[PDB]
């Protein structure tokens, strides 16, 4: 059964290598979440540092692709960094060739097309990662676009990724049923981060310290990650309410 | 099955068994460590004296990259040399274009991406080494450890090889007992002790100690080998602690 | 490495056969039958479309019969997509010859080159062969009217009447029975249709499941005309011979 | 425009006896009207009892001698330390020189 | 078993079987011995013949005036590697007017052998080499294995029954290391060392091959009647 | 390193089957139902927008794609394979035609170029076939309106009307009853919506249905005025609101 | 399947070892080196009586001072001979001299291992390269597809090799004349050959310093065959 | 090289080509045949740059002979001339173009008609009743305009050709050492030995 | 490029791909070559399961490589065209550089070398073809007949056959062909060639092709009636 080793069709029209790449996604056992505000897009991810000898500042699955675009990865770090470096190069080249900053959705498509090539061409394996791209696009506004090893991609009102993704997904679905809108109706990004953390706490059922989380925030003309103290300040605000 | 016969093939778990098999070659190799300190890093390695016929001090395993980065590894020694040769090419092209010497995090990703590239195709074999490396740059001291998968992180202390668990346990005690920091000269002495303690897991053949270090104050930010009086002082410190 | 997954398309069996060529021929044996009949004053090409659907657009469709130049046409049996690759190559080859020598390409030369391409895919490159058999119908001033066939092996032969695709065994027996050398085009038209009508796997032979073409000297004085039959023209010729 | 050649002057002289041979050359190296060196040798022992000089443009002369010395070395490796005969050396040098027929070594060579 | 089809495949215990099989070709090869003092370095090689009508396979190759090796295993692979060493030694001379350090010679061989163990299609070198040389830091002896591993030693031996000579040198270490300014005595110690690997056969005139390099001695090989002194 | 897969991954089996093409067709069978109907004065192509999640914005994912101003495409099977085919199809329309002749290719020839690309994935080294079937609707001056189906093999067939994917067998039978040669475009849109309701299970509205037409020229969608010969694209994607209007009088 | 350049567990290249089996199936070729010259002789082995035996070219000139006899898949030898001839002539062009027999053999043996995944497989032919040069005199070399070559005083290759080699072991001494060596090749060929030895199914050749490499006529070999039979009957 | 002429009459094509090969101030040869038989009924004469002429002629000859063997069929003079023109048309935009002018005289066996083609080094082809390359044309064209008739015999064509050679021998600056004359007709190619 | 080593050695020292190519030759229609005192004759079988053929345009079994050399074959027909084309190109190239047509030996040696190259080149399979190459060297009246095979070996033959049932016709030729006295005339040589094919063929109608080659580029193919006369004459003498 060599049709399960390379990316060719099985008798039932399936690509097993692609399906097994999807299972590599959860190998880190980390859950991510992304939501949109009025002016911003917030992404949050669990941060697990098991080894005491690790330098916790270097342990990260969130990446600054360009000034405007941020990317969080669900999957092993080597493939995550492979994807990040390529996305950075693609975003830079786009700006040089076409004279404007690469949009979040266009980068997502480009990376998705690359992923598609690995599902069709035999010598290249799929990357075992799910890439969630976030920005505040100058045309489309707050944006979340997500790519997988199949080469599939789509925009999102909000999204979640990881082992307990379904619990987070339904938690967010129920909120948007209630609020009757496509986003978090909130002025400051600080409170959108608070929303994101609060709803992750409810869905996963765990409490978070400052070092258990990792936060990325996209605003107009910049994407940035929060420090431990920025998150701690944010956790204190949730607790006092 | 047959998922483990070819590199870059995902198993039904989502694993690349060929990379995990390369890790076994690393686990088989001699012990090597890295200790981050106040203003730099210290590297040390176990050299098994196979025979009396081995010339002492003349089978050097620790390698320098550029002038400010030290690299040490455990597993297939030739694979480690190939990786350093690439590292030197990467560091040379960085300095050529950007003038400044390559930063350690920048350098770490250059090796990471190259090792990760050897998990993408069935026409190449994964690297049979875990590489501990680091140095001093504009932002201070950095220690890294890189694995056959291309996975790397920053470390306070790092260890790999046959005596990795013994060394890790000893490293964890140093991190706990010295929260404010460990000095460069202390780290050299501790490195010696930890190699001697980690030698208990490889005690058939007796061994030769080799240490190197980068420190902003002690070596002026450059990579140097610990030799002569400072080496013997570290050996004596290690000898006193085992007894 | 990649050796593991190589089918080895260009090798011999222990018996001295080319596996892939033999299996490509097996593929072609399920394709709709195509018949060529060469008369003294023209050539007929007849072909059966593969199980037609009632909602298929019949008039603006081309599956079996293709034009290579003004003097040469081909009937296809096998994978259409593969045939189109080869047809465009053959079309280009004909124009290269015309550009070079200022003369229309002799039929055999075009056939040989197309057959040499197929041969290449069986001897080198490690690729699968083209799953296609052609019937070439054409005219030149050296040999006059000519019928050829080529198959995935790259071997070609000349014929007075020939069939490719499905039920060739039965079709060839029927052609061998009723064919004679002093035959006219209009008689060959009738023979072609009668043969398909008996060898068809369908219940009854109808206009919508046929492609038809003639190459006559029926133009005005010493010149050749290609006629790719329209749906209504096939309907009329089918009534005229008394099949429907 | 860049001129890749120059004239370093000097002169050389070879004479052959019955059981010996001499190859002489002055030690002066010049450019235009200046003296570069009063002692810059240009007659070299190349091994196998072969002496050589390539006078004219010194850079091309040094390059040629360097290549022939290296040619002698590889002749030993490839042919079981066989002594390179003077006639065989000569023919080898022809191929070195002619190899640059369309960008010549500006030298008069004597062995 | 299932992991020895090519060099690109690791076994479940982390072994490279094609490299190990290449290592096996060395064990089948005829014995050769290396040893050095502070002033000189010596290679001693037992040559092998096909039969009495054949010549004895030449084991020792010269790389430069100051460096050379002895081989054990596939002789054509030794020819490729020795040729590479000749070029590297020669590059160092032409470009830098510098004799190639014996340590760098080893590093270059290691890296060349390694590339063949990590790529599909190729194969490991099927030969082991003992490189001797005299450079700016005195006399040297190296042991090359086609895994890539190169090792600097006082003395060693490779080939069939090389453990006999290797044990002898391990005992004699303190004696032969101090044979300074005496070529013939250092060779004698090497000839006595290789004699510990002999079974049924003894050292004859067209069987023994000796090479030496040192302080005021270019790399020179002795065969035939020139080695009759040491029998 | 390097692509060592220089050999065919699709080969003939002893029975004469091309396994990978058959298996690609099986992947198309699993795919969501899409259809196309040709009218006298237009063509309609339609499909269901299968949403992966309710949090996902299905507007951002376009199953019906403009290839040229007068040609549109829809698919059934693997979405990523379709997306790259659309990219290549758009580009080939320029490189192999518009940059030569100064005008857009006719439907049949663009279809032929797409078919060629899909055939090469069936024979070239180190690749699998595309896991999609396309329905390409288009108009050109000399051929008028046309509708084509393109399969993983690279074979293409012109259709009066057809369906592909999940419930294609039932959908084709439905279309055979309703189709005639005198259908106006609005009648074809009506039948398309009826046919598609059979295969769709969940919600059936303008937000879950994607539908486009090849009809009259749209000067309002051109973007400029002044050139009389340039009259605008015949391809138009129906809006969510425009679909719901026709679902009331269903 | 498996790689072309793969090692066996015993430390040998599979393909090289399999090519050696092909060489054992080949027709017998014998070479004997003396101080008066080197003799080369081969079994022609015509597959049918209708085949014109004089067209069987298994002994071949490389240069005036170097000859060559082959055994195994003889079609594979053509490109080896072509390379040898070019190497010999090219060296004469570059150095105005004859090329050493050993250096020629080494150049041929460099082709041997240039196979893998360069050509697709090793050569299926062994060569006996006989010649003369001023330095090492009369020489005989056995060049294998392993890339290895041994110098020999005498050597047999092909199907009757192990039986002929044992015979050459006893018969060869350092004072053999050329005439003695010619008869010895004919004697040993007649022993190991299936069909009865004559001038048509066996061929002799030699290389001497004075006359260079010469293939013998069927008339000349026939007289040596007749001389051989008389000498064996004489005791 | 220098003088090549061609005359197409009723039933044949006649090619006259100068015998002199000059380099510098020396006539090296006075019996040179500046022509190659491309096929049994097709002859090509040539003139131009030294070396290029023969190299080109023989290259064309080899290609036509290869075609003949492959198809067991003689290419028509028109077909050969078109092939030759295309080769020159490629050549002119090459790194180093063939500087060769040719006349192609052939008898088409299918049409039963003689044909004369004039092709210059640029790839400029024309079918003509009479043709010339180089300075020859400046005398012969006007002479043939006057004396040529389309229905002439081969013998009349040879007298007409004698008239051209006489004029060239009178008014040309260089000594071209007479001409080799060859006739191409239904029976193939033959050389006139006494001219 | 496709690199795979398809022709490789097996444990017993055989190259199976080359040997399987010989099986393709054994499947092919029979071809025979007989050389007389002043001529060579090439006889060829044509299988009679193919009726409704057009013999005018169907590729002939004997091919001219030059005006003085011919090539017949047994095995894969498509493969033979590639060898014939290369041989024809080399024939013209030889005339161009040497100013002399090829010898029959040289042309054979070239074709055989091409066949050999395809037995140790990566990505290719051997030619499933054996050839009989016959003719007369330039300015020479001695007949030449050579054989080649997929492995690349070649040799000269007084008479030889290849293809299916070739072992039967080789048996016939081995007793009927006298080396001391070959067929003195054209008629004798053609008759012996036709006789040898009649051991295998079936009927002597449109199943036998005969091509006679004589010195100085004198090659002619016999027609049906001309061959049928030999068939009629042989059968009447047989009934005895
Ligand atoms: Cl893209
Ligand atoms: Mg002109």
Swiss-Prot record, chain A:
It comes from the Eukaryota. This is Proteasome subunit alpha type-1. The keyword Nucleus applies. The 26S proteasome consists of a 20S proteasome core and two 19S regulatory subunits. The 20S proteasome core is composed of 28 subunits that are arranged in four stacked rings, resulting in a barrel-shaped structure. The two end rings are each formed by seven alpha subunits, and the two central rings are each formed by seven beta subunits. The catalytic chamber with the active sites is on the inside of the barrel. Interacts with CIC1. It comes from Saccharomyces cerevisiae (strain ATCC 204508 / S288c) (Baker's yeast). The keyword Plastid does not apply. InterPro entries: Ntn_hydrolases_N (IPR029055), Proteasome_alpha (IPR050115), Proteasome_alpha-type (IPR023332), Proteasome_asu_N (IPR000426), Proteasome_sua/b (IPR001353), Proteasome_subunit_alpha6 (IPR034642). Its main location: cytoplasm. Present with 15200 molecules/cell in log phase SD medium. The proteasome degrades poly-ubiquitinated proteins in the cytoplasm and in the nucleus. It is essential for the regulated turnover of proteins and for the removal of misfolded proteins. The proteasome is a multicatalytic proteinase complex that is characterized by its ability to cleave peptides with Arg, Phe, Tyr, Leu, and Glu adjacent to the leaving group at neutral or slightly basic pH. It has an ATP-dependent proteolytic activity.
Curated annotation (Swiss-Prot), chain B:
The alpha and beta forms are probably products of the same gene with different post-translational modifications. It is found in: Cytoplasm; Nucleus. One of its GO terms (molecular function) is mRNA binding. The 26S proteasome consists of a 20S proteasome core and two 19S regulatory subunits. The 20S proteasome core is composed of 28 subunits that are arranged in four stacked rings, resulting in a barrel-shaped structure. The two end rings are each formed by seven alpha subunits, and the two central rings are each formed by seven beta subunits. The catalytic chamber with the active sites is on the inside of the barrel. Keywords: Acetylation, Cytoplasm, Nucleus, Proteasome. Belongs to the peptidase T1A family. Present with 12000 molecules/cell in log phase SD medium. The proteasome degrades poly-ubiquitinated proteins in the cytoplasm and in the nucleus. It is essential for the regulated turnover of proteins and for the removal of misfolded proteins. The proteasome is a multicatalytic proteinase complex that is characterized by its ability to cleave peptides with Arg, Phe, Tyr, Leu, and Glu adjacent to the leaving group at neutral or slightly basic pH. It has an ATP-dependent proteolytic activity. GO terms for cellular component: nucleus; proteasome complex; proteasome core complex, alpha-subunit complex; proteasome storage granule.
Curated annotation (Swiss-Prot), chain E:
Pfam families: Proteasome, Proteasome_A_N. InterPro entries: Ntn_hydrolases_N, Proteasome_alpha, Proteasome_alpha-type, Proteasome_asu_N, Proteasome_sua/b. One of its GO terms (cellular component) is proteasome complex. There is a cross-link at residue 188 (Glycyl lysine isopeptide (Lys-Gly) (interchain with G-Cter in ubiquitin)). The modification Phosphoserine is found at residue 11. Its main location: cytoplasm. The keyword Glycoprotein does not apply. SUPFAM superfamilies: N-terminal nucleophile aminohydrolases (Ntn hydrolases). Keywords: Cytoplasm, Isopeptide bond, Nucleus, Phosphoprotein, Proteasome, Ubl conjugation. The keyword Cytoplasm applies. It is found in: Cytoplasm; Nucleus. GO terms for biological process: proteasomal ubiquitin-independent protein catabolic process; proteasome-mediated ubiquitin-dependent protein catabolic process. The 26S proteasome consists of a 20S proteasome core and two 19S regulatory subunits. The 20S proteasome core is composed of 28 subunits that are arranged in four stacked rings, resulting in a barrel-shaped structure. The two end rings are each formed by seven alpha subunits, and the two central rings are each formed by seven beta subunits. The catalytic chamber with the active sites is on the inside of the barrel. Present with 7210 molecules/cell in log phase SD medium. Belongs to the peptidase T1A family. This is Proteasome subunit alpha type-6. It comes from Saccharomyces cerevisiae (strain ATCC 204508 / S288c). The lineage of its organism: Eukaryota, Fungi, Dikarya, Ascomycota, Saccharomycotina. The gene is PRE5.
UniProtKB/Swiss-Prot annotation, chain H:
Keywords: Acetylation, Cytoplasm, Nucleus, Phosphoprotein, Proteasome. The modification Phosphoserine is found at residue 76. SUPFAM superfamilies: N-terminal nucleophile aminohydrolases (Ntn hydrolases). PROSITE patterns: PROTEASOME_BETA_1, PROTEASOME_BETA_2. Coiled coil: none annotated. One of its GO terms (cellular component) is proteasome core complex, beta-subunit complex. This is Proteasome subunit beta type-4. It comes from Saccharomyces cerevisiae (strain ATCC 204508 / S288c) (Baker's yeast). The lineage of its organism: Eukaryota, Fungi, Dikarya, Ascomycota, Saccharomycotina.
């Amino acid at each position: 059964g060599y049709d399960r080793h390379i990316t060719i069709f099985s008798p039932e029209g399936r690509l097993y290598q692609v399906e097994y790449a999807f299972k590599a996604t959860n190998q880190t056992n980390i859950n991510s979440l992304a939501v949109r505000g009025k002016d911003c897009t917030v992404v949050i991810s669990q941060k697990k540092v098991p080894d005491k000898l690790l330098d916790p500042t270097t342990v990260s699955y969130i990446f600054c692709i360009s000034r405007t675009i941020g990317m969080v990865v669900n999957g092993p770090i080597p493939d995550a960094r492979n994807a990040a470096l390529r996305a950075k190069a693609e975003a830079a080249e786009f700006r040089y060739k076409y004279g404007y900053d690469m949009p979040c959705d266009v980068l997502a498509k480009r990376m998705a097309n690359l992923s598609q090539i690995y599902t069709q061409r035999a010598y290249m394996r799929p990357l075992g990662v799910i890439l969630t791209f976030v920005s505040v696009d100058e045309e489309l506004g707050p944006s979340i676009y997500k790519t997988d090893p199949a080469g599939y991609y789509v925009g999102y009102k909000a999204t979640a990724t990881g082992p307990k993704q379904q619990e987070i997904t339904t938690n967010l679905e129920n909120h948007f049923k209630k609020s009757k809108i496509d986003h978090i109706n909130e002025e400051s990004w600080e409170k959108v981060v608070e929303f994101a953390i609060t709803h992750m706490i409810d869905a996963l059922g765990t409490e978070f310290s400052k070092n258990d989380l990792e936060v990325g925030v996209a605003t107009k003309d910049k994407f940035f990650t929060l420090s431990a103290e920025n998150i701690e300040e944010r956790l204190v605000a949730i607790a006092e309410q | 099955t047959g998922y483990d016969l070819s590199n870059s093939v995902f198993s039904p778990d989502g694993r690349n068994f060929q990379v995990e098999y390369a890790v076994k070659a690393v686990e088989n190799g001699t012990t090597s460590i890295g200790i981050k300190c106040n203003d730099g890093v210290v590297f040390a390695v176990e050299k098994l004296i196979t025979s009396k016929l081995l010339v002492p001090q003349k089978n050097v395993k620790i390698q320098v990259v550029d002038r400010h980065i030290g690299c040490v590894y455990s597993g297939l020694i030739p694979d480690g040399r190939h990786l350093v040769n690439r590292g030197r090419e990467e560091a040379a092209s960085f300095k050529k274009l950007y003038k400044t010497p390559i930063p350690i995090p920048a350098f770490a990703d250059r090796l990471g991406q190259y090792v990760q590239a050897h998990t993408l195709y069935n026409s190449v074999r994964p690297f049979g080494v875990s590489t501990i490396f680091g140095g001093v740059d504009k932002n201070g001291a950095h220690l890294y450890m890189l694995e056959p998968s291309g996975s790397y992180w920053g470390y306070k202390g790092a260890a790999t090889g046959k005596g990795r668990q013994s060394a890790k346990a000893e490293l964890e005690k140093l991190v706990d007992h010295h929260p404010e920091g460990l000095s460069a000269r202390e780290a050299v002495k501790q490195a010696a002790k930890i190699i001697y303690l980690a030698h208990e897991d490889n005690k058939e053949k007796d061994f030769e100690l080799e240490i190197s270090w980068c420190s902003l104050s002690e070596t002026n930010g450059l990579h140097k080998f610990v030799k002569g009086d400072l080496l013997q002082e570290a050996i004596d410190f290690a000898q006193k602690e085992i007894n | 490495g990649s050796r593991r997954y190589d089918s080895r398309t260009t090798i011999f069996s222990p018996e001295g056969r080319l596996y892939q060529v033999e299996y490509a021929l097996e593929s072609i044996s399920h394709a709709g039958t195509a018949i060529g009949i060469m008369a003294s004053d023209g050539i007929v090409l007849a072909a059966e479309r593969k199980v037609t659907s009632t909602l298929l657009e019949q008039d603006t469709s081309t599956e079996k019969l293709y034009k290579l130049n003004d003097k040469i046409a081909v009937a296809v049996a096998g994978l259409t997509a593969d045939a189109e690759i080869l047809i465009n190559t053959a079309r280009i080859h004909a124009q290269n010859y015309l550009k070079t020598y200022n003369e229309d390409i002799p039929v055999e030369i075009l056939v040989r080159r197309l057959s040499d391409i197929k041969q290449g895919y069986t001897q080198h490159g490690g690729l699968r062969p083209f799953g296609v058999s052609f019937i070439y119908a054409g005219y030149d001033d050296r040999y006059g009217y000519q019928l050829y066939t080529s198959n995935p092996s790259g071997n070609y032969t000349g014929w007075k009447a020939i069939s490719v695709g499905a039920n060739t065994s039965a079709a060839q027996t029927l052609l061998q029975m009723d064919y004679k050398d002093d035959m006219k085009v209009d008689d060959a038209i009738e023979l072609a249709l009668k043969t398909l009508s008996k060898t068809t796997d369908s219940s009854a032979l109808t206009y919508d499941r046929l492609e038809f073409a003639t190459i006559r000297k029926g133009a005005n004085d010493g010149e050749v005309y290609q006629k790719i039959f329209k749906p209504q023209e096939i309907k009329d010729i089918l009534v005229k011979t008394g099949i429907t | 425009q860049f001129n890749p050649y120059g004239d370093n002057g000097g002169t050389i002289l070879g004479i052959a006896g019955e059981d010996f041979a001499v190859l002489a050359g002055d030690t002066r190296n010049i450019t235009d009207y200046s003296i570069n060196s009063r002692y810059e040798p240009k007659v070299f022992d190349c091994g196998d009892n072969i002496v050589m000089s390539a006078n004219g443009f010194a850079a091309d002369g040094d390059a040629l001698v360097k290549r022939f010395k290296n040619s002698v070395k590889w002749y030993h490796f490839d042919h079981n330390d066989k002594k390179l005969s003077i006639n065989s050396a000569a023919r080898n040098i022809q191929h070195l020189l002619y190899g640059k027929r369309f960008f010549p070594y500006y030298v008069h060579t004597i062995i | 078993n299932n992991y020895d089809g090519d060099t690109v495949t690791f076994s479940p215990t982390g072994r490279l079987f094609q490299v190990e099989y290449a290592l096996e070709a060395i064990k089948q090869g005829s014995v050769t011995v290396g040893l050095r003092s502070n002033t000189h370095a010596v290679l001693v090689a037992l040559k092998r013949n096909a039969d009495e009508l054949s010549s004895y396979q030449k084991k020792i190759i010269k790389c430069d005036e100051h460096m050379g090796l002895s081989l054990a295993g596939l002789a054509p692979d030794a020819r490729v590697l020795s040729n590479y060493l000749r070029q590297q030694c020669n590059y160092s001379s032409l470009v830098f007017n510098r004799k190639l350090a014996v340590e760098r010679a080893g590093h270059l061989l290691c890296d060349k052998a390694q590339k063949n163990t990590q790529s599909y299609g190729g194969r490991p070198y099927g030969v082991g080499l003992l490189i001797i040389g005299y450079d700016k830091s005195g006399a040297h002896l190296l042991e090359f294995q086609p895994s890539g591993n190169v090792t600097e030693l006082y003395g060693t031996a490779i080939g069939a029954r090389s453990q006999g000579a290797k044990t002898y040198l391990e005992r004699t270490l303190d004696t032969f290391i101090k044979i300074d300014g005496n070529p013939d005595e250092l060779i004698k110690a090497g000839v006595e060392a290789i004699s510990q690997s002999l079974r049924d056969e003894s050292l004859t005139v067209d069987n023994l091959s000796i090479a030496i390099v040192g302080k005021d001695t270019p790399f020179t090989i002795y065969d035939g009647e020139a080695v009759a002194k040491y029998i | 390193m390097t692509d060592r897969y220089s050999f065919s991954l699709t080969t003939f089996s002893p029975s004469g089957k091309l396994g990978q093409i058959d298996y690609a067709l099986t992947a198309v069978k699993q795919g969501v139902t899409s259809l196309g109907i040709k009218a006298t004065n237009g063509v309609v192509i339609a499909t269901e927008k299968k949403s992966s999640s309710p949090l996902a914005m299905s507007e951002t994912l376009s199953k019906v794609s403009l290839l040229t101003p007068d040609i549109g495409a829809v698919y059934s099977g693997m979405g990523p394979d379709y997306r790259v085919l659309v990219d290549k199809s758009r580009k080939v329309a320029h490189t192999s035609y518009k940059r030569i002749y100064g005008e857009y290719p006719p439907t049949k020839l663009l279809v032929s170029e797409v078919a060629k690309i899909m055939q090469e994935a069936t024979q070239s080294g180190g690749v699998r076939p595309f896991g999609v079937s396309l329905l390409i609707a288009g108009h050109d001056e000399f051929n008028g309106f046309s509708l084509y189906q393109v399969d993983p093999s690279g074979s293409y067939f012109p259709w009066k009307a057809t369906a592909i994917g999940k419930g294609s067998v039932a959908a084709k039978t439905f279309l055979e009853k309703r189709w005639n040669d005198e259908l106006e475009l609005e009648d074809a849109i009506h039948i398309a919506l009826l046919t598609l309701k059979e295969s769709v299970e969940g919600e059936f509205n303008g937000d879950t249905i994607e539908l486009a037409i090849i009809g009259d020229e749209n000067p309002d969608l051109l973007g400029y005025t002044g050139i009389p010969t340039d009259k605008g694209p015949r391809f138009r994607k129906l809006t969510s609101q425009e679909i719901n209007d026709r679902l009331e009088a269903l | 399947d498996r790689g072309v350049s793969t090692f066996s567990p015993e430390g040998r290249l599979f393909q090289v070892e399999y090519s050696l089996e092909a060489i054992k199936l080949g027709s017998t070729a014998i070479g004997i080196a003396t101080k008066e010259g080197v003799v080369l002789g081969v079994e022609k082995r015509a597959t049918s009586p209708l085949l014109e035996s004089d067209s069987i070219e298994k002994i071949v000139e490389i240069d005036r001072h170097i000859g060559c006899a082959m055994s195994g898949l003889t079609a594979d030898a053509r490109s080896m001979i072509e390379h040898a001839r070019t190497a010999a002539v090219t060296h004469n062009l570059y150095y105005d001299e004859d090329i050493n027999v050993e250096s020629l053999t080494q150049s041929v043996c460099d082709l041997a291992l240039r196979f893998g995944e360069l050509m697709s497989r090793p050569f299926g032919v062994a060569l006996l390269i006989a010649g003369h040069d001023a330095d090492d005199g009369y020489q005989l070399f056995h060049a294998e597809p392993s890339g290895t070559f041994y110098r020999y005083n005498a050597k047999a290759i092909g199907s009757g090799s192990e039986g002929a080699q044992a015979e050459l072991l006893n018969e060869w001494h350092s004072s053999l004349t050329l005439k003695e060596a010619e008869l010895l090749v004919l004697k040993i060929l007649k022993q190991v050959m299936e069909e009865k030895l004559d001038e048509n199914n066996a061929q002799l050749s030699c290389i001497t310093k004075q006359d260079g490499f010469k293939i013998y006529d069927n008339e000349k070999t026939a007289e040596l065959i007749k001389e051989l039979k008389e000498k064996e009957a004489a005791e | 090289m220098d003088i090549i002429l061609g005359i197409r009459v009723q039933d044949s094509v006649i090619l006259a080509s100068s015998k002199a090969v000059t380099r510098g101030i020396s006539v090296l040869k006075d019996s040179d045949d500046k022509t190659r038989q491309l096929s049994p009924h097709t002859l090509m004469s040539f003139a131009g740059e030294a070396g290029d002429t023969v190299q080109f002629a023989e290259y064309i000859q080899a290609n036509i002979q290869l075609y003949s063997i492959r198809e067991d069929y003689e290419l028509s003079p028109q077909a050969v001339s078109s092939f030759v023109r295309q080769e020159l048309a490629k050549s002119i935009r090459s790194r180093r173009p063939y500087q060769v002018n040719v006349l192609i005289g052939g008898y088409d066996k299918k049409k039963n008609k003689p044909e004369l083609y004039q092709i210059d080094y640029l790839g400029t082809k024309v079918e003509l009743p009479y043709g010339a390359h180089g300075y020859s044309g400046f005398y012969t064209f006007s002479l043939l305009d006057h004396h040529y008739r389309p229905d002439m015999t081969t013998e009349e064509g040879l007298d007409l050709l004698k008239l051209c050679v006489q004029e060239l021998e009178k008014r040309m600056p260089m000594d071209f050492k007479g001409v080799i004359v060859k006739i191409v007709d239904k029976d193939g190619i033959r050389q006139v030995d006494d001219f | 490029g496709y690199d795979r080593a398809l022709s490789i050695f097996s444990p017993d020292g055989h190259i199976f791909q080359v040997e399987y190519a010989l099986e393709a030759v054994k499947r092919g229609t029979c071809a025979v070559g007989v050389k007389g005192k002043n001529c060579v004759v090439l006889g060829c079988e044509r299988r009679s399961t193919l009726k409704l053929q057009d013999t005018r345009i169907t590729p002939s079994k004997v091919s001219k490589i030059d005006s003085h050399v011919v090539l017949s074959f047994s095995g894969l027909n498509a493969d033979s065209r590639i060898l014939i084309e290369k041989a024809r190109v080399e024939a013209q190239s030889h005339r161009l550089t040497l100013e002399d047509p090829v010898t029959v030996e040289y042309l054979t040696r070239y074709v055989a070398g091409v066949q050999q190259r395809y037995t140790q080149s990566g990505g290719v399979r051997p030619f499933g073809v054996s050839t009989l190459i016959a003719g007369f060297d330039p300015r020479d009246d001695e007949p030449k007949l050579y054989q080649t095979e997929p492995s690349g070996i070649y040799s000269s033959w007084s008479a030889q056959t290849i293809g299916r049932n070739s072992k039967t016709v080789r048996e016939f030729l081995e007793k009927n062909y006298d080396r001391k006295e070959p067929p003195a005339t054209v008629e004798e040589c053609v008759k012996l060639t036709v006789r040898s094919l009649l051991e295998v063929v079936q009927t002597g109608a449109k199943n036998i092709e005969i091509t006679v080659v004589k010195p100085d580029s004198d090659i002619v193919a016999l027609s049906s009636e001309e061959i049928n006369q030999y068939v009629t004459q042989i059968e009447q003498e047989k009934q005895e």
